[PDB]
Amino acid sequence: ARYLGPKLKLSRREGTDLFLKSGVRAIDTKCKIEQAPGQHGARKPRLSDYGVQLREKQKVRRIYGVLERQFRNYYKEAARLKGNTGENLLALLEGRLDNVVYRMGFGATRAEARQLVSHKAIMVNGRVVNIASYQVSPNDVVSIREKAKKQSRVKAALELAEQREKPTWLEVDAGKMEGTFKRKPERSDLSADINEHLIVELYSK
Amino acid sequence: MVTIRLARHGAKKRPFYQVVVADSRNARNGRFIERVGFFNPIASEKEEGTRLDLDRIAHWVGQGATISDRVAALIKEVNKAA
Amino acid sequence: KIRTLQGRVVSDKMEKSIVVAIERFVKHPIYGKFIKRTTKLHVHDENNECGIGDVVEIRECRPLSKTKSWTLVRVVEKAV
Amino acid sequence: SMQDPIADMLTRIRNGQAANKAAVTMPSSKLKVAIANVLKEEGFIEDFKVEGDTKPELELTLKYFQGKAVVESIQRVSRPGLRIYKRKDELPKVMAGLGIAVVSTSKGVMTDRAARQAGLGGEIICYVA
Amino acid sequence: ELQEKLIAVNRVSKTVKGGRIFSFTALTVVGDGNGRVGFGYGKAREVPAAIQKAMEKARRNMINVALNNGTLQHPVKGVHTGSRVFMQPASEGTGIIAGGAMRAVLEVAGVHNVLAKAYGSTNPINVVRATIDGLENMNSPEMVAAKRGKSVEEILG
Amino acid sequence: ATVNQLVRKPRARKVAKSNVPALEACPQKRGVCTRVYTTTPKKPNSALRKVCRVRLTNGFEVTSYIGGEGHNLQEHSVILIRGGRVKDLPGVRYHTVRGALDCSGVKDRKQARSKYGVKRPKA
RNA sequence: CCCGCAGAAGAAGCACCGGCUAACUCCGUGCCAGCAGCCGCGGUAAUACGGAGGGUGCAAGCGUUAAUCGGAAUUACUGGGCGUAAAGCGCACGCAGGCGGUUUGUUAAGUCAGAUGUGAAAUCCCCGGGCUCAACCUGGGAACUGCAUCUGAUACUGGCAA
RNA sequence: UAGCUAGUAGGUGGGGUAACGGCUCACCUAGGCGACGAUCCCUAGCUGGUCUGAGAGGAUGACCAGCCACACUGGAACUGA
């Protein structure tokens, strides 16, 4: 149900830093981005329109860790909700619990935040939650358990997320190891580059 | 006989009840006349699921219906609680 | 006001009863055109009074034979 | 053998716009007068005059915005072969509201918008782009 | 900024006394992304010469069409040779849902949200021409206010 | 296309016929081998094609195709026929399932094993 | 359901990779063996067969077959055609049927509006709630495009009369 | 698959039914249905719904709920609200 394979190969097929390794050593300094993982990656392809749509959908699915049946359920939920369907699709993906954990600064990656949520560490509104795909409501309080507060990888994640950009739809306390999910993010808040119109056009066929 | 009783709906090991007045030879979830409310025995803390409109209850009992044991108890609690 | 249907008489030929064709101006559910559909009824003619060509107001009643559950109230616009 | 005279009027308007005619003449009737009244009221024609007394003739002045015809499309919607009556909710917004549906409601001939604002529907006579 | 798209590359042949001679045709579109669309049809003995012919043909013959914030104004039926294109404006979001050639034309046109359907022959040259005919057949509220001789608010309500 | 002509007799959906009529709207069917032979394809394909005659449990006798490099079918073998037309072979419109009642898997295969009933080879 | 233990420990396959259709090279064989949804591939340098390496897609499932709708505007009411592509009876007359120039009055059957009864519950849709989330369950609503009656309107269609 | 139908169609009267009725008998009249498809043949439980589809439609009617029919096959009543 997870990918659990080579992650930098996923970053290299797309050609974009998906932030799915970490941030400490740089990703070009790991090596070999701009190159597909072939033995034929030295030759880049013509990559037709259905290929381009599929590559943007694969990019957005790999940058969060969501599999395809959950992703098309998210598409149906974004489609039946009123408003811009692609913005609803990105809002429903940012509403996931492990993403809120990784953005708030606990867990250095999204897979690390998923292992943190999985292993019963994180309490949202005074109750611990097992499920990574839990939708964090606005004005919810995301915190850690007693025992998992004294966990050193959460300290290192607090440091390298201090070097990160501190996204503004959530507010981190960082000293009580708490935060709040203040509001729903809009398109201008998040990531500025991904083409959600290509994703909605794929499932619309 | 027309009787007021409980039809059992809901999931497995999480029961829900519709308090509903029906001809008493019909099946438990089968053909009825009208549902005069609902009952939720496992509902939650802070959750109030027990609703009875007493107008149709009194209308049907005045027409000659027969209140079941759970339904008569639930009428007792919602009629002494208010 | 009693429920009453208005129809022309088609045949008068048995005894104490007439056969009456009511036309309804229905609409087609598929194609959308108003088409005319016809319904022949056996109507109980007590007093045996009306003829083949006229219009008759008719209401329904108790069954009277293996057909014939409609009865004449009155003849509006008798004909020749 | 001229079953439909409203479609004859609409064909005359369409052909006069296509052939760049200055004015269009036809036999009149009060239905044609009401349809031409609302076609003046929106701005598809310039005006009209009814001239005869026993054999009455109606003459319409066609409007031409500089390059084109002002009327681009005009379709008889209800036809004698297939009458079309819509309700008050099913009244169509023609050309996303930029064109009119002439509707003969029980207050007379009006447009789609006046029938919807009045609260009543009826036989749709023609879509006018 | 004149973004450019290649729609189709076809190989055509002309027979002579020796044998078959093959050439390549290219159908391209250019556009500002704001209203202006153009289509070009180049033909040359080898492919990138035909692409350059099609681009310099498309850049000249560009027509401007009117479009709302990213959308059409009304439903509109474009027609050409065997193509009976039908394009309906949209609600916001949902992207361009259109097939192939029409998708490329509407994307360089700057139409972000559309619902389109091709009828008849979906041959690429003829559906590009039917698409751009339906686009230049479109009219704006201000121009239909210029026609009927009244302000736009008396038309919209 | 006149609406009166459509009212008097309406538009007619054609008929849907099946290219697998001995399967009787079932996915597979068991039959027994009446004959195991080979035939030649239509003219541009030029091979020998392993095709067996099957009598089915509903009483149809149809020719099925044994697809895969080398088989073990015999006279009176009980096989499971599947459906799917063989394009070159005339009159052959069913396949035999490999991994069936009697029909074994293909030998020494490793890619698309489940299309030929070959178990996963362990090392 | 909550708590304590131990340890990375017990836990990844399936189809595909010529075009459509995302994803490529080597080797074996040589119109044979075989593949194939359609086009088609294999004749000694096979991206199409079989193995390998690499990649792609989905994932506790993945493929095939069967079946239904879609795409198919390919039975077209919305929404097609008929000189030559399939398709105007050989030509008329005419009953049934369909359609009906123009003015006025009346009826109000069609039509329109409103109301009332009905259209079981569930399901579908919206706003919420409860299961750690989701599936699932559930409160209220909307809807059920309909039918009958009643009250009016009367432009348009029909009747009646001139 | 173009004609079908004599209790067949209607009437009077006796009988029968919880109840109207050719429901059944005696009599009288010769009618009733049918090209808005009677009769015959083939297939089929019907509906709320389900699936698909932009919609209109099309296909369907497992589960869940309403109605019907049946209870080895053919028939008959008894008892009883």
Q: Are D92 and D85 in contact (CB under 8 A)?
A: no
Instruction: Calculate the angstrom distance between C1' of G146 and CA of A109.
Output: 59
Lookup: tokens for D68: 């084109």
Nearest nt (C1') from B35 Cα = G121
Entry field: residues in chain E:
157
In chain D, residues under CATH classification 3.30.1490.10 are: 72-129
Which residue is it, tokens 């032979």?
Answer: F37
Instruction: List Cβ neighbours of E11 (8 Å cut-off, separation of 6 or more).
Output: E22, E23, E24, E25
CA-nearest of A178, A199, A6, A183 to A106 is A178
Lookup: tokens for F27: 């996915």
User: What is the arrangement of strands in the sheet containing E96-97, beginning at the earlier edge strand?
Assistant: E76-77, E86-88, E114-117, E96-97
What is the Cα–Cα distance from E23 to E95, expressed in whole angstroms? 36
**DSSP codes joined into one string, chain B:** -EEEEEEEEEETTEEEEEEEEEETTS-SSS--SEEEEEE-TT--SS---EEE-HHHHHHHHHTT-EE-HHHHHHHHHHHH--
**CATH code that applies to domain D72-129:** 3.30.1490.10
Lookup: tokens for F105: 């898997």
Lookup: tokens for F73: 């079918």
Q: Is A25 exposed, middle or buried (0-12, 13-18, 19+ CB in 10 A)?
A: exposed
Other CB atoms within 10 Å distance of the CB of residue D87: 9
Q: Are E92 and E46 in contact (CB under 8 A)?
A: no
Beta strand segments in chain D, E:
23-27, 45-50, 57-62, 74-76, 85-86, 100-105, 108-110, 122-128
Lookup: tokens for E157: 């309500």
Instruction: Calculate the angstrom distance between C1' of G24 and CA of A52.
Output: 19
Rg value, chain B, Cα: 13
Please give the C-alpha separations between residue E97 and each of A6, F41, F44, in angstroms, as whole numbers. 35, 44, 42
Tell me which method was used to determine the 3D structure. cryo-EM
Min Cα distance D82 → chain C (Å) is: 6
Lookup: tokens for E15: 């027979």
Q: Give the homologous superfamily in CATH for domain A7-93+190-203.
A: Ribosomal protein S4/S9, N-terminal domain (1.10.1050.10)
For chain D positions 80-109, those within 8 Å of chain C (CB to CB) are 81-84
Instruction: List Cβ neighbours of A65 (8 Å cut-off, separation of 6 or more).
Output: A2, A3, A20, A98, A110, A111, A114
C47 CB contact with strand H at below 7 Å: no
Same CATH fold assignment for domains A7-93+190-203 and A94-181:
no
Q: Are D28 and D57 in contact (CB under 8 A)?
A: yes
Q: Specify the pairing of strand D23-27 against strand C34-44.
A: unpaired
User: Which sign, positive or negative, has the C-alpha torsion F18, F19, F23, F29?
Assistant: negative
Other CB atoms within 10 Å distance of the CB of residue A4: 7
Q: Does F5 touch chain C (CB under 8 A)?
A: no
What does the buried/exposed string (b/e) look like for F64-92 if buried means 16 or more CB atoms within 10 Å of the residue's CB?
Answer: bbbbbeebebeeebebbbbbeebeebeeb
Q: Are F96 and F36 in contact (CB under 8 A)?
A: no
- Ranges of H-type helices in A18-172: 49-64, 68-80, 85-94, 97-104, 110-118, 146-149, 152-162
Q: Which amino acid is at A40?
A: H
What is the Cα–Cα distance from A133 to A98, expressed in whole angstroms? 7
What is the Cα–Cα distance from A91 to D69, expressed in whole angstroms? 49
Lookup: tokens for B55: 């107008």
Please give the C-alpha separations between residue C22 and each of C68, F64, F94, in angstroms, as whole numbers. 14, 63, 59
C32 CB contact with strand H at below 7 Å: no
A94-181: CATH architecture: Roll (3.10)
Q: Which amino acid is at B80?
A: K
For chain D positions 44-103, those within 8 Å of chain E (CB to CB) are 44, 63, 65, 68, 70, 95-98
Extents of the domains making up chain B:
1-81
Beta bridge partners of A171: A180
D1-71: CATH architecture: 2-Layer Sandwich (3.30)
The residue in chain C having the minimum alpha-carbon distance to the alpha carbon of residue F6 is C31
Q: Residue A16 has what DSSP assignment?
A: S
Map residue A89 onto helix, strand or coil: helix
What is the Cα–Cα distance from A170 to A185, expressed in whole angstroms? 9
Instruction: List Cβ neighbours of C66 (8 Å cut-off, separation of 6 or more).
Output: none
CA-nearest of E15, E25, E138 to E85 is E138
Beta bridge partners of C76: none
Q: Residue A149 has what DSSP assignment?
A: H
C18 CB contact with strand H at below 7 Å: no
Q: Residue E7 has what DSSP assignment?
A: E
Instruction: Calculate the angstrom distance between C1' of G102 and CA of D125.
Output: 19
C-B interface (Cβ pairs under 8 Å ≥ 3): no
- Ranges of H-type helices in chain F: 3-8
Map residue E3 onto helix, strand or coil: strand
Enclosing H/E stretch for E79: none
Q: Are E131 and E123 in contact (CB under 8 A)?
A: no
HEC string of E88-150 equals ECCCCCCCEECCCHHHHHHHHCCCCCEEEECCECCCHHHHHHHHHHHHHCCCCHHHHHHHHCC
| Dihedral over alpha carbons A130, A133, A137, A143 (to 10 degrees) | 40
Residue E80 backbone dihedrals phi, psi, to 5 degrees: -150, -155
Q: Specify the pairing of strand B50-52 against strand D74-76.
A: unpaired
**Structure resolution, Å:** 2.9
Which residue is it, tokens 């076609």?
Answer: D39
Q: Are C28 and C11 in contact (CB under 8 A)?
A: no
**DSSP codes joined into one string, A111-125:** HHHHHHHHTT-EEES
Q: Are F52 and F58 in contact (CB under 8 A)?
A: no
| Dihedral over alpha carbons A32, A34, A35, A36 (to 10 degrees) | 120
CA-nearest of B61, D82, E105, A36 to C34 is D82
What is the Cα–Cα distance from A63 to A196, expressed in whole angstroms? 13
Which residue is it, tokens 């009980």?
Answer: F78
* Of the options 2.60.120.380, 2.40.50.140, 3.30.428.10, 2.40.110.10, the CATH number for the domain spanning F1-123: 2.40.50.140
CA-nearest of F11, F59, F63 to F37 is F63
